[PDB]
Amino acid sequence: MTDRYSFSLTTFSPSGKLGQIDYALTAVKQGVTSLGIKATNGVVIATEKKSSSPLAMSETLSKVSLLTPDIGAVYSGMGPDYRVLVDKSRKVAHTSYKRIYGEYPPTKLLVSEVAKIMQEATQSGGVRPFGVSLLIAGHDEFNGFSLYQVDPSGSYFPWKATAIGKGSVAAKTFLEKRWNDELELEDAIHIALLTLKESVEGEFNGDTIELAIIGDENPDLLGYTGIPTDKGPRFRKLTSQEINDRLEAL
Amino acid sequence: GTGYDLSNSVFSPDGRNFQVEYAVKAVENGTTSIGIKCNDGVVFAVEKLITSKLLVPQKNVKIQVVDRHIGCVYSGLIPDGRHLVNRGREEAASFKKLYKTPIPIPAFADRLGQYVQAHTLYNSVRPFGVSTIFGGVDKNGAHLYMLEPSGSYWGYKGAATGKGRQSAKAELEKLVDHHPEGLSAREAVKQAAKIIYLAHEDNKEKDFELEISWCSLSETNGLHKFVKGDLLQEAIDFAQKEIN
Amino acid sequence: GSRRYDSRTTIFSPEGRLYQVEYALESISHAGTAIGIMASDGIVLAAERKVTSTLLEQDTSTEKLYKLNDKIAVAVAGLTADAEILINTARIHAQNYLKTYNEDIPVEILVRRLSDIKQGYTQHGGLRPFGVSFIYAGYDDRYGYQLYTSNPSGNYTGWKAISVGANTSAAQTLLQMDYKDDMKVDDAIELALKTLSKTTDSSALTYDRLEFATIRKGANDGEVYQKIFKPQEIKDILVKTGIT
Amino acid sequence: MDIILGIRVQDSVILASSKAVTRGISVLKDSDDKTRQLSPHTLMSFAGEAGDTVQFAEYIQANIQLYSIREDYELSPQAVSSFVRQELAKSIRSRRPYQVNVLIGGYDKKKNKPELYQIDYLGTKVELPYGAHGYSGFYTFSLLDHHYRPDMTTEEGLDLLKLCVQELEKRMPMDFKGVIVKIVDKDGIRQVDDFQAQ
Amino acid sequence: FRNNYDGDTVTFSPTGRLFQVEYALEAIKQGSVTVGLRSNTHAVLVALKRNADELSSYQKKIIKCDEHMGLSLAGLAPDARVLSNYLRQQCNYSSLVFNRKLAVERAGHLLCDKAQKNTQSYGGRPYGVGLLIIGYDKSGAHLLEFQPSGNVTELYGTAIGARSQGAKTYLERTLDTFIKIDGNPDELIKAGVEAISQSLRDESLTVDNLSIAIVGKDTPFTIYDGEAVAKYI
Amino acid sequence: QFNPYGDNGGTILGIAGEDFAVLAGDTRNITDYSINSRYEPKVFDCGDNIVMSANGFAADGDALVKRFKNSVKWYHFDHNDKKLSINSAARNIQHLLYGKRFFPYYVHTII
Amino acid sequence: DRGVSTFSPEGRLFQVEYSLEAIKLGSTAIGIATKEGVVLGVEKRATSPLLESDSIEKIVEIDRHIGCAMSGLTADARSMIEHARTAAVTHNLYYDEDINVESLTQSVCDLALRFGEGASGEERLMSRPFGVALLIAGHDADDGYQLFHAEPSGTFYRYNAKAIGSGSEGAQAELLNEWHSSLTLKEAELLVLKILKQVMEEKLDENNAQLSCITKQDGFKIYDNEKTAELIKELKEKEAAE
Amino acid sequence: GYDRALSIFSPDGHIFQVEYALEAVKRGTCAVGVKGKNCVVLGCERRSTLKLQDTRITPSKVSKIDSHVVLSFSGLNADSRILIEKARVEAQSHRLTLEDPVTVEYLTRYVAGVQQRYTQSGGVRPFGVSTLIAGFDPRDDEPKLYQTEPSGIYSSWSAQTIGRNSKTVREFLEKNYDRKEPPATVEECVKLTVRSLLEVVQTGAKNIEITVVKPDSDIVALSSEEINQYVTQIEQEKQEQ
Amino acid sequence: AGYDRHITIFSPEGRLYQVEYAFKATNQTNINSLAVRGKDCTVVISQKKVPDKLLDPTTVSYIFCISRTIGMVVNGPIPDARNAALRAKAEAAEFRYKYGYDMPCDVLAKRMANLSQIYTQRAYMRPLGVILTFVSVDEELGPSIYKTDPAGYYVGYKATATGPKQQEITTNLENHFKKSKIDHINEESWEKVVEFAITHMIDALGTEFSKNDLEVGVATKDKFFTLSAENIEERLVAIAEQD
Structure with missing residues (x-):
């Protein structure tokens, strides 16, 4: 027994490329599209719930996850890798920050943490890079609203708006036309739903789409009252219904 | 491409693990052995190729006992x-130590099962080159088991493996039909000594020595014991008499 | 075993070269160019962001210029992810030195530490080298302003002006042409911009595709100050030097 | 215990250290030097637990010398003492702590000023005009508190010491067999081989 | 074929063979010959010692594991040293802990189990040496043949090494004869030296070339070299 | 609390003649005021013509002897049955004893 | 690649064999064992006239009654000498006596096969076999003077005379004739000095060759250049005298 | 966890990794050392593929392991550092335990052992470095000059060179250094050194740096000028013929 | 170059062949199975194919009892299936101990999927060629069906099927739900839900079963159990009087 695989599985090639990273990215390209737009008072991330069989319950499978009460993430690439990444992220958020400073980490930091994890699976012994790209959106008191993208290489960049996956190229273009630095949250949700329609082939409604936002504090989603400083989570997942309402005036 | 059979735990394009399969070849190539489950016990018998006259008779024992109530016999790489038995013996002790009651046959089987299945998970180890027939008597019945290098094992009425496995199997399938209500410990011992003799035809070139053991709630009291002396001869003859 | 898949990242080529290092260097040569120029009154760090978009956020960014200490900063060329790992360990060494001696880590000591870490992945552990090259700019009371460079091989050196990344060949010749030992911070800032400008692979050189930092010793104080130019400040210094 | 005195004058530091080494009933030696040279311009005196005393001294010495060679530079007295304090402060919570008290006196060739640091076995460091360890201070501090002036010449310094050593020889119970004195200035470390009757 | 499956012991041939183990066996056959036979009171080991030059000594091939046990080697000297040593401990452990003398049949099981391990895991290599263990315990004289494959067998007599096939056919014939040499040691030896020559072909077993060991009823396993065997040449 | 030591009494004597030597010792084994045995051999023959006795705490004495004897055995195994000179046995025994310098063999031993 | 401790289809260990090929390229070293002592001689073999020939150490002392010569990758012998010396001293500490020449040898040979990448048996950490052979010569009260040859294979033989190195097969066949169970120490020294001269690529002189012996009375000593130069001369004379 | 045997024997009895480690030395800049009668001198060549450096802070080619011993090398720089470090530490350790600085032979022996160990340990490749270690034993006045290489072998030389074009320069030294009469002056010794370097540096006033180590921890490096002065006079020696 | 097919590393196309081949292995038993949800129970059916006459039919099962409330059926070789079952039981036993309440079906499913994902990324661990379907009546989600594969993927179903003729069973059930408009068999007794399953099993596979051709597990409030040859027989008989 024993992991004899203690050497790197990702190495440099004569041309200067890192094979496995390139391939991992290729895997992300095949993934279902997903995107994120940054408004001036909120951020929105959304993707397509590509069901594997009409017998499968697509609710029991979220592609958009909450990392902290003010940070959510969505992906493109391999579902399983995303899942475990979300877990590792939710934890690193406590162990490396909340348990020390007593408050959740600011977006760029938590992202920097997720990136670290992904980076290691690029150099550590006997493992392949994660086959996913994430779009993390959150809000912290001193940076406001932000949106980041993390790649299998472990690299990450901030965006005003962007998309990844299958039809990223087409969608990126579509956003560059409708985005401006004055967009109000509701506007972005609108633009979001639109950019998302160009990808979706089949049913385009509040059951084949998953969408969440990082906006105002929802004290109705806190669970308790008594502490003035605790006003609720800024991360809300839009309900099946809430989606359609905005689809009619589309 | 190819080369899907040079490292252990690798899946070939069809979903097979060639190394495990190559292990089997090592089994079929070895001597043969069988297990017959009677109405309250089990009997193990195995062929012992007598390479030369220098081999002391009644000495190079091949059947093994795990704890006090289990018997194991195997074909392939001795x-x-x-x-595999050493592991089984430790596995059993560990169980008796924690639970007091001597380890149930089904439970013991899985212990060997998991342990064997394990050697098909990593390429740093080679699979087991043996199939094992083992069983005994426990709290509720008698059990006979056969374990493959793939870690696969099932419960059996009768089982055999090795060189003359098909011959044996044939003979066993007969017994299962002509004794639907059950066979007795005394019967099985003879019947077995026979099966070995017939199944010895696929390796008739060499002289062989027989070996049997049993575990009957009434005959052995629930303990695994070897068949020697008079009771043994009675079955050797029962065979020599029907081999003609 | 596993030997089959081991790339053997730490071996010598028949010509005494280190495969991975050579390749990692090759990797680096496609990274945005970063330049470091040292004047009598300060150091200038400027880097070109490789590939951009209209939606890319440039305010909440800092992908190539990192602050290691209060007196030391670095410009990166290569895998940002790797770069960050080394940067963080570097920021630690600096703090340990401070905690141990109540003095700021001398620039060379910090640079050497990092280079050794890199050199390590070169001689043992079978892991790939970090695809990163650094330009270090710092100040200490023993040599004042210093400029250093470290690459994947774990080797490091000191310069008056240097470049890492793509087109270092062309950029170095241009620098080696208009550089003079009595330069002044603002001359360098200008020289830097010109150089990046003549070696870019883009149409024009705009403010959004740049990073700028200067370690000056503001005559109005007596201490050292690190300034990482903001989107606006870059736009300005871009028009002034005449590039609109 | 032993005598460990130090005084920072105008352009140097003076370290007085008893010469006796007693093991129970007898005085084994009367010519002991309770000091090590950490660098050409930094000196360290020490007193305490029988074995740990020299072991610690020599361990610190080796490290400073290794730093000097590695970097071709001399750490400032301040740096050296901060390093020593950390060493002591670490071992205080270890299985077996070093029970050593030290006096670090050096001349900072960069600031052109002498410096005197006092650090006890716990890792408590303090910078002073003059200091002592153990019972030594109990006798000398009143004298030093009285006669001490920041601009004293090395000569006035030695006279002040000589005065402390005399008060120690009069009121203190044990015979520490006189002291060895050393001066640290812009020119290095030198020993005043004439204090037995100066 | 073979070429791709003999890389290491962890690999199985498509036919079900373990080449590395088989190769180890080959180092045995290339080794010098040695023989073993026992009566009902004694057990004897006769081995032919090999040498490099005419200025080199003849590498000893008999090793004592305890007062009632010993063996002879065929192949890699070191591996035999390793194994004999391990066996020496197992005997020692038995005496110390249980004050019992280790059954020869049990020493066989131990050797087998040890060897087996070096054939199922990566990195290791089969032991390249064969062994003949003789001993007198609580159930009489014994003789075992050990194979790097992990197969240990109890016999009345046998031999291993180069040309070992000669003495092995000889003893297969002389069976009914020696097996009854109870009470007379000198006979079993002469009988062994007669089987040992059945595999010669180069020279005649000289004084400092023959090696003989014996154990039994009232004989603590002892080795005979040189003039000690002159009366058997 | 548990005390790992005990005292089984007994005495041993050793005299060296010009070409011989004797090592005697009573054969009584006790515990406080009771007698455990009127005959418990306390002096042994360890081979290579060496007699030894570890008197004091029985359990310790026996363990030591047993260890020494087994030491002789391996001395033969490792150095082609060479004879363990008495001076070598002595030195060897010192190492055996000092090996438990911080949890001693509560015995006075003579060979 | 393939296990660093694999068997060839001939039942041989690749690395051990290849290890032997490396030793065939080393300087020649010869040993003659006589009832008056053992003699060890080695071909210095510098690789440039600037190299201070006396800093070449191919004959070392393991203890006062044991010394040895090396051949092949000499750097690999450092730890063997170290393990050897330690074993000899350790033995003395535990037993108040000198370690038997054979024992010391068996101990050195025990390291020999401690190599691989994870061979199930203990903790053999050493990536390859030693690329050097040794001639351990010494004396003890039980078997008097002895000469041993230790190989990277782990096996060791006792010889009356033996040569290892580039000119071994040649010089060995030579010793075959010359050796008889009654040579004197002097005869041996000259004999060694003689054979070295034959196999050496250079013209043998007190500067590119070194001698030494081991006698029960004064133990292991290395012959200084003055003493050797004389035996060189004394040899030239007895050769021209017929 | 990584132990793959990288340095192993090949069919012909060679250990290619050590072999190739040596090829790295051949590529490194040239270094030379010649011992006088009361001193040892170490010369090295500075590259010129890239120029615009800052010689003040850039690592120099001759390192002090201790106040009385220096070490220069040829090959991978990054590797040399690791050895320099272990040497300096072993140097202090030795003073701490034996209460006396190391002798050049000892310090060399130690560095060589380190190199050797890396040739037969798993997961590590040999040092692509070869070194020259010179100095004066404590309280001794007789000069010492040693050289080590990846294989782990070391020895002393009256004069030696390592690095690119070491063949050419060694040849120069072989027919220019008389052991009968070694440079009896710190002066003529540095001359012989520069002369040899000039066979390969091809005009390099700034491309040649020398260091002179004398008894009792007296080490010192010459500045471009002092060297340039030697160059200037050496070029005239040829044209006056 | 060609080894990106032997261990779990990306291929130039971004694929993990070893995982793909693992899926292949799950059909090696040539057995089919399907699960359906009652109004308040969950049923799983799997073909039982005993070839040899020498086998003791009662020891041949691919349905396991993970916990007092969770049942799991496996599609794939038996050794891997048993390996997976053991782990699943240990995981469920531990969870209870540590958190103070029985481990939910979907949770155990997730945990198993996570473990499977690890073999997808680490090189020395090979994927398990099996597909695990967990069922139970969660005290919060009611009847539950969760399935995981070698890729580390998992999801909850309204009903599902696995095996060679998987697609037939699926489109079959798929149609029955479009027709009934509700996402579950609307029955009160489980005996009927079991029958419904055995029915649509036959209608899809196009074959008839005897009491020794099936294997049935039933999950209910606080208990999961498997029917016996006879309990099944009584079920075949009931569907016999209606067709």
Whole structure:
């Protein structure tokens, strides 16, 4: 027994490329599209719930996850890798920050943490890079609203708006036309739903789409009252219904 | 491409693990052995190729006992078999130590099962080159088991493996039909000594020595014991008499 | 075993070269160019962001210029992810030195530490080298302003002006042409911009595709100050030097 | 215990250290030097637990010398003492702590000023005009508190010491067999081989 | 074929063979010959010692594991040293802990199990040496043949090494004869030296070339070299 | 609390003649005021013509002897049955004893 | 690649064999064992006239009654000498006596096969076999003077005379004739000095060759250049005298 | 966890990794050392593929392991550092335990052992470095000059060179250094050194740096000028013929 | 170059062949199975194919009892299936101990999927060629069906099927739900839900079963159990009087 695989599985090639990273990215390209737009008072991330069989319950499978009460993430690439990444992220958020400073980490930091994890699976012994790209959106008191993208290489960049996956190229273009630095949250949700329609082939409604936002504090989603400083989570997942309402005036 | 059979735990394009399969070849190539489950016990018998006249008779024992109530017999690479039994013996002790009651046959089977299945998970180890027939008597019945290098094992009425496995199997399938209500411990011992003799035809070139053991709630009291002396001869003859 | 898949990242080529290092260097040569120029009154760090978009956020960014200490900063060329790992360990060494001696880590000591870490992945552990090259700019009371460079091989050196990344060949010749030992911070800032400008692979050189930092010793104080130019400040210094 | 005195004058530091080494009933030696040279311009005196005393001294010495060679530079007295304090402060919570008290006196060739640091076995460091360890201070501090002036010449310094050593020889119970004195200035470390009757 | 499956011991041939183990066996056959036979009171080891030059000594091939046990080697000297040593401990452990003398049949099981391990895991290599263990315990004289494959067998007599096939056919014939040499040691030896020559072909077993060991009823396993065997040449 | 030591009494004597030597010792084994045995051999023959006795705490004495004897055995195994000179046995025994310098063999031993 | 401790289809260990090929390229070293002592001689073999020939150490002392010569990758012998010396001293500490020449040898040979990448048996950490052979010569009260040859294979033989190195097969066949169970120490020294001269690529002189012996009375000593130069001369004379 | 045997024997009895480690030395800049009668001198060549450096802070080619011993090398720089470090530490350790600085032979022996160990340990490749270690034993006045290489072998030389074009320069030294009469002056010794370097540096006033180590921890490096002065006079020696 | 097919590393196309081949292995038993949800129970059916006459039919099962409330059926070789079952039981036993309440079906499913994902990324661990379907009546989600594969993927179903003729069973059930408009068999007794399953099993596979051709597990409030040859027989008989 024993992991004899203690050497790197990702190495440099004569041309200067890192094979496995390139391939991992290729895997992300095949993934279902997903995107994120940054408004001036909120951020929105959304993707397509590509069901594997009409017998499968697509609710029991979220592609958009909450990392902290003010940070959510969505992906493109391999579902399983995303899942475990979300877990590792939710934890690193406590162990490396909340348990020390007593408050959740600011977006760029938590992202920097997720990136670290992904980076290691690029150099550590006997493992392949994660086959996913994430779009993390959150809000912290001193940076406001932000949106980041993390790649299998472990690299990450901030965006005003962007998309990844299958039809990223087409969608990126579509956003560059409708985005401006004055967009109000509701506007972005609108633009979001639109950019998302160009990808979706089949049913385009509040059951084949998953969408969440990082906006105002929802004290109705806190669970308790008594502490003035605790006003609720800024991360809300839009309900099946809430989606359609905005689809009619589309 | 190819080369899907050079490292252990690798899946070939069809979903197979060639190394495990190559292990089997090592089994079929070895001596043969069987297990017959009677109405309240089990009997193990195995062929012992007598290479030369220098081999002391009644000495190079091949059947093994795990704890006090289990008997194991295997075909293929002898060393691997012993190894698998050593593990089984530790596995059993560990169980008796924690639970007091001597380890149930089904439970013991899985212990060997998991342990064997394990050697098909990593390419740093080689699979077991043996199939094992083992069983005994426990709290509720008698059980007979056969374990493959793939870690696969099932419960059996009768089982055999090795060189003359098909011959044996044929003979066993007969017994299962002509004794639907059950066979007795005394019967099985003879019947077995026979099966070995017939199944010895696929390796008739060499002289062989027979070996049997049993575990009957009434005959052995629930303990695994070897068949020697008079009771043994009575079955050798029962065979020599029907081999003609 | 596993030997089959081991790339053997730490071996010598028949010509005494280190495969991975050579390749990692090759990797680096496609990274945005970063330049470091040292004047009598300060150091200038400027880097070109490779590939951009209209939606890319440039305010909440800092992908190539990192602050290691209060007196030391670095410009990166290569895998940002790797770069960050080394940067963080570097920021630690600096703090340990401070905690141990109540003095700021001398620039060379910090640079050497990092280079050794890199050199390590070169001689043992079978892991790939970090695809990163650094330009360090710092100040200490023993040599004042210093400029250093470290690459994947774990080797490091000191310069008056240097470049890492793509087109270092062309950029170095241009620098080696208009550089003079009595330069002044603002001359360098200008020289830097010109150089990046003549070696870019883009149409024009705009403010959004740049990073700028200067370690000056503001005559109005007596201490050292690190300034990482903001989107606006870059736009300005871009028009002034005449590039609109 | 032993005598460990130090005084920072105008352009140097003076370290007085008893010469006796007693093991129970007898005085084994009367010519002991309770000091090590950490660098050409930094000196360290020490007193305490029988074995740990020299072991610690020599361990610190080796490290400073290794730093000097590695970097071709001399750490400032301040740096050296901060390093020593950390060493002591670490071992205080270890299985077996070093029970050593030290006096670090050096001349900072960069600031052109002498410096005197006092650090006890716990890792408590303090910078002073003059200091002592153990019972030594109990006798000398009143004298030093009285006669001490920041601009004293090395000569006035030695006279002040000589005065402390005399008060120690009069009121203190044990015979520490006189002291060895050393001066640290812009020119290095030198020993005043004439204090037995100066 | 073979070429791709003999890389290491962890690999199985498509036919079900373990080449590395088989190769180890080959180092045995290339080794010098040695023989073993026992009566009902004694067990004897006769081995032919090999040498490099005419200025080199003849590498000893008999090793004592305890007062009632010993063996002879065929192949890699070191591996035999390793194994004999391990066996020496197992005997020692038995005496110390249980004050019992280790059954020869049990020493065989131990050797087998040890060897088996070096054939199922990566990195290791089969032991390249064969062994003949003789001993007198609580159930009489014994003789075992050990194979790097992990197969240990109890016999009345046998031999291993180069040309070992000669003495092995000889003893297979002389069976009914020696097996009854109870009470007379000198006979079993002469009988062994007669089987040992059945595999010669080069020279005649000289004084400092023959090696003989014996154990039994009232004989603590002892080795005979040189003039000690002159009366058997 | 548990005390790992005990005292089984007994005495041993050793005299060296010009070409001989004797090592005697009573054969009584006790515990406080009771007698455990009127005959418990306390002096042994360890081979290579060496007699030894570890008197004091029985359990310790026996363990030591047993260890020494087994030491002789391996001395033969490792150095082609060479004879363990008495001076070598002595030195060897010192190492055996000092090996438990911080949890001693509560015995006075003579060979 | 393939296990660093694999068997060839001939039942041989690749690395051990290849290890032997490396030793065939080393300087020649010869040993003659006589009832008056053992003699060890080695071909210095510098690789440039600037190299201070006396800093070449191919004959070392393991203890006062044991010394040895090396051949092949000499750097690999450092730890063997170290393990050897330690074993000899350790033995003395535990037993108040000198370690038997054979024992010391068996101990050195025990390291020999401690190599691989994870061979199930203990903790053999050493990536390859030693690329050097040794001639351990010494004396003890039980078997008097002895000469041993230790190989990277782990096996060791006792010889009356033996040569290892580039000119071994040649010089060995030579010793075959010359050796008889009654040579004197002097005869041996000259004999060694003689054979070295034959196999050496250079013209043998007190500067590119070194001698030494081991006698029960004064133990292991290395012959200084003055003493050797004389035996060189004394040899030239007895050769021209017929 | 990584132990793959990288340095192993090949069919012909060679250990290619050590072999190739040596090829790295051949590529490194040239270094030379010649011992006088009361001193040892170490010369090295500075590259010129890239120029615009800052010689002040850039690592120099001759390192002090201790106040009385220096070490220069040829090959991978990054590797040399690791050895320099272990040497300096072993140097202090030795003073701490034996209460006396190391002798050049000892310090060399130690560095060589380190190199050797890396040739037969798993997961590590040999040092692509070869070194020259010179100095004066404590309280001794007789000069010492040693050289080590990846294989782990070391020895002393009256004069030696390592690095690119070491063949050419060694040849120069072989027919220019008389052991009968070694440079009896710190002066003529540095001359012989520069002369040899000039066979390969091809005009390099700034491309040649020398260091002179004398008894009792007296080490010192010459500045471009002092060297340039030697160059200037050496070029005239040829044209006056 | 060609080894990106032997261990779990990306291929130039971004694929993990070893995982793909693992899926292949799950059909090696040539057995089919399907699960359906009652109004308040969950049923799983799997073909039982005993070839040899020498086998003791009662020891041949691919349905396991993970916990007092969770049942799991496996599609794939038996050794891997048993390996997976053991782990699943240990995981469920531990969870209870540590958190103070029985481990939910979907949770155990997730945990198993996570473990499977690890073999997808680490090189020395090979994927398990099996597909695990967990069922139970969660005290919060009611009847539950969760399935995981070698890729580390998992999801909850309204009903599902696995095996060679998987697609037939699926489109079959798929149609029955479009027709009934509700996402579950609307029955009160489980005996009927079991029958419904055995029915649509036959209608899809196009074959008839005897009491020794099936294997049935039933999950209910606080208990999961498997029917016996006879309990099944009584079920075949009931569907016999209606067709």
